[PDB]
Amino acid sequence: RPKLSEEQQHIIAILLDAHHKTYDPTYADFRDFRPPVRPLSMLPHLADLVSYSIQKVIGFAKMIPGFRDLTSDDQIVLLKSSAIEVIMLRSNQSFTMDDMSWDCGSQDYKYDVTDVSKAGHTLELIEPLIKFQVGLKKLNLHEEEHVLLMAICIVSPDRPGVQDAKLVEAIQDRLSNTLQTYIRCRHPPPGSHQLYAKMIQKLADLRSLNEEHSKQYRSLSFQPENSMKLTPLVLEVFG
């Protein structure tokens, strides 16, 4: 009999709140960003959107149970490698399958494939990105599952640069066991059908998206003209 322990429920409650503290479904701060233009017209706005979102991802990470027991070097490598992944993941909350667009409250803040290519991406990234968003949206995760997946994503032991892989593995294990156990006790059939394995597969899709993302970033980078238009958090994190 798999039972959701007190500790597992506490874990879930923390990550929910950590998400509520770091994802503003008003999208109010978006007026602060350089404005969108619709020749790489979107790059300044989307650089800013991503920069902001790295900050939120860092705030969420810090609240992951056991994350503050890592060395600050391990914390750093885990965010550098996961950031873009966690952003694609969290963005699922604003993605809508009507338009296959990310809809953040108004026409200005509604982002479709033309906008993404207007930041220098080809169908190399965009096509598997949209398929990823679609497949994730079709899982209909409970919010509990969404937040566990983000956290499992951040605390991955195999990330390049990881020093104490054993500790990272032990923290992620407690999160995966919490997720596996939650699906069992709380996700009804038939939605729950191989839901864990489907979730893990999304993490593999995100690794492949990460790789492609690195390529396109490294390419965009080698022109200082473009790199100039980014933020310093983005340069630090993706450089």
């Binding site: 860092i58 810090k62 600050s72 914390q75 750093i76 965010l79 310093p232 958090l233 630090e236």
Partner: peptide, 11 residues
């Protein structure tokens, strides 16, 4: 060499 990230991470 990640002062911004390291600053956002500190307590």
């Amino acid at each position: 060499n990640h002062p911004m990230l390291m600053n956002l991470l500190k307590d």
